[PDB]
């Protein structure tokens, strides 16, 4: 290291001028020289933290935290030196793979909340939690797209009024689907009084 010029020299152990080049490709871009792959630049930041004092109060303890430019949780929490009980990813999709479904729910919320609140706007937890919960409860991560929710097996007439308008009805005609008519959309279409607030119950003498 203490030299003025730094050099590596390497020989093998015809067609050899060609296969010294297939090593030079592999050498540059396959040599994990240290650390975890996927992760790019990593910055130390001095995060604030309120935490209990012996006496009882909450006082400011300043905490050095690390900020990354890529995701491989499977391999960064399993590291010496770091607390693997608090490490967070803004990717709630990796959290779903690694820490289970129920841990994802909270990161998915932690995300949705972090959109809303960054801008100024507050919105009450029952709301974002309900979205979050609806996505999360099917078993995995059900999207709010034609691929997600509009797939799960809800009475055909309902799903029509969204996106794949005809093919829904089509394969619904072939699988001989039955429609409950408990859904809002189904009763808007039939022009009847929809099982909602005012029509949720029934009146008799």
């Amino acid at each position: 290291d203490n030299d003025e010029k730094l050099i590596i020299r390497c020989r093998v152990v015809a067609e050899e001028d060609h296969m010294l080049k297939k090593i030079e490709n592999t050498m540059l871009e396959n040599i994990t020289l240290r650390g975890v792959e996927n992760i790019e630049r990593v910055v130390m930041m001095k995060y604030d933290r309120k935490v209990p004092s012996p006496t009882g109060e909450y006082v400011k303890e300043p905490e050095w935290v690390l900020e990354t430019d890529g995701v491989n949780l499977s391999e960064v929490m399993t590291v010496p030196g770091i607390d693997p009980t608090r490490i967070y990813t803004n990717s709630f999709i990796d959290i779903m793979e690694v820490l289970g479904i129920e841990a994802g729910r909270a990161a998915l919320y932690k995300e949705v909340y972090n959109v809303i609140a960054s801008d100024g706007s507050y919105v009450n937890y029952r709301h974002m939690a309900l979205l979050v919960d609806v996505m999360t409860t099917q078993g995995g991560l059900t999207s709010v797209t034609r691929h997600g929710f509009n797939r799960s097996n809800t009475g055909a007439l309902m799903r029509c009024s969204f996106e794949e308008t005809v093919e829904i009805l089509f394969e619904a005609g072939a699988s001989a689907e039955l429609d409950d008519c408990r859904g809002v959309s189904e009763n808007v279409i039939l022009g009847q009084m929809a099982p909602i607030g005012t029509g949720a119950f029934d009146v008799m003498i």
Binding site: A200, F201, D202, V203, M204, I205
Partner: peptide, 16 residues
């Protein structure tokens, strides 16, 4: 008011 609210529970059961 001589009416009766009939409430429904998901399975299909009902309270008056």
């Amino acid at each position: 008011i001589p009416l009766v609210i009939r409430r429904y529970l998901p399975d299909g059961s009902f309270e008056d």
